[PDB]
Design an enzyme around this catalytic site. Structure first.
Site, mmCIF file in Angstrom:
data_model
loop_
_atom_site.group_PDB
_atom_site.id
_atom_site.type_symbol
_atom_site.label_atom_id
_atom_site.label_comp_id
_atom_site.label_asym_id
_atom_site.label_seq_id
_atom_site.Cartn_x
_atom_site.Cartn_y
_atom_site.Cartn_z
ATOM 1 N N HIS A 183 0.836 -1.196 0.000
ATOM 2 C CA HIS A 183 0.000 0.000 0.000
ATOM 3 C C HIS A 183 0.873 1.250 0.000
ATOM 4 O O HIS A 183 2.049 1.225 0.366
ATOM 5 C CB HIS A 183 -0.978 0.024 1.195
ATOM 6 C CG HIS A 183 -0.328 0.421 2.483
ATOM 7 N ND1 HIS A 183 -0.917 1.278 3.386
ATOM 8 C CD2 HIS A 183 0.884 0.098 3.001
ATOM 9 C CE1 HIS A 183 -0.102 1.454 4.411
ATOM 10 N NE2 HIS A 183 0.997 0.752 4.200
ATOM 11 N N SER A 191 -5.890 6.286 9.741
ATOM 12 C CA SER A 191 -4.518 6.636 9.405
ATOM 13 C C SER A 191 -4.428 7.649 8.265
ATOM 14 O O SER A 191 -3.435 8.383 8.189
ATOM 15 C CB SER A 191 -3.736 5.376 9.029
ATOM 16 O OG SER A 191 -3.263 4.710 10.182
ATOM 17 N N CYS A 238 3.590 5.957 5.535
ATOM 18 C CA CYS A 238 3.622 4.785 6.383
ATOM 19 C C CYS A 238 5.035 4.205 6.365
ATOM 20 O O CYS A 238 5.728 4.253 5.338
ATOM 21 C CB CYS A 238 2.604 3.759 5.884
ATOM 22 S SG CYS A 238 1.623 3.029 7.166
ATOM 23 N N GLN A 291 -7.327 -2.044 10.397
ATOM 24 C CA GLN A 291 -8.558 -1.263 10.388
ATOM 25 C C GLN A 291 -9.518 -1.818 9.342
ATOM 26 O O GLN A 291 -9.129 -2.073 8.193
ATOM 27 C CB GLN A 291 -8.267 0.214 10.106
ATOM 28 C CG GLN A 291 -7.106 0.799 10.904
ATOM 29 C CD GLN A 291 -6.941 2.297 10.689
ATOM 30 O OE1 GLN A 291 -7.924 3.024 10.504
ATOM 31 N NE2 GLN A 291 -5.698 2.766 10.710
ATOM 32 N N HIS A 345 -5.481 5.600 1.389
ATOM 33 C CA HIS A 345 -4.661 4.481 0.960
ATOM 34 C C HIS A 345 -4.953 4.172 -0.493
ATOM 35 O O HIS A 345 -6.096 4.311 -0.937
ATOM 36 C CB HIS A 345 -4.927 3.204 1.782
ATOM 37 C CG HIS A 345 -4.569 3.316 3.231
ATOM 38 N ND1 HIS A 345 -3.365 2.877 3.733
ATOM 39 C CD2 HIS A 345 -5.269 3.785 4.291
ATOM 40 C CE1 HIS A 345 -3.331 3.088 5.034
ATOM 41 N NE2 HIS A 345 -4.472 3.642 5.398
#
Ligand SMILES: *c1ncc([N+](=O)[O-])c(N(CC(C)(C)C)[C@@H]2CCS(=O)(=O)C2)n1
Length: 113
Positions: free
Chosen positions: A9, A104, A63, A81, A107
């Site tokens: 990701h 977060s 990330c 999540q 994505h």
């Protein structure tokens, strides 16, 4: 559906993310509107062939996974999540999601295994 999938990701954080900092930027100052613009622009470059997904994840993903070119490894359900988990399991291997919103941030996901 398998017990686990493996995904890479790219995450773009914004100033209202769960943790508005990353390895590449000490304070995330960009709006969620600007985070999605980036996500959508990364998707178009990846679709045109102009950009390689894992090259982009290694440069601009907010990330820590970016040091592994976006890869997270294999994970089952019940771990990540829910929006990320659901999106990841709805992909065919080699398929790239559209935008995915979690606490977060935003994505792009690519299922590999
Ligand atoms: C970014 N890089 C790595 C990584 N990870 O170690 O798996 C994550 N990660 C999982 C942790 C909870 C931080 C261990 C993401 C959290 C948000 S997510 O559901 O997209 C997975 N993130």
């Amino acid at each position: 559906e398998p017990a686990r999938v493996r995904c890479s990701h790219l995450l773009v954080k914004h100033s209202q993310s769960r943790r508005p900092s990353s390895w590449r930027q000490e304070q995330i100052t960009r709006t969620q509107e600007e985070a999605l613009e980036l996500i959508n622009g990364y998707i178009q470059k990846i679709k045109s062939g102009e950009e390689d997904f894992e090259s982009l994840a290694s440069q601009f993903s907010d990330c820590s996974s970016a040091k592994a070119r976006g890869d997270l490894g294999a994970f089952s359900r019940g771990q990540m999540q829910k929006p990320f988990e659901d999106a990841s399991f709805a992909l065919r291997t080699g398929e790239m999601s559209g935008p995915v919103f979690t606490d977060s941030g935003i994505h792009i996901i690519l299922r590999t295994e």
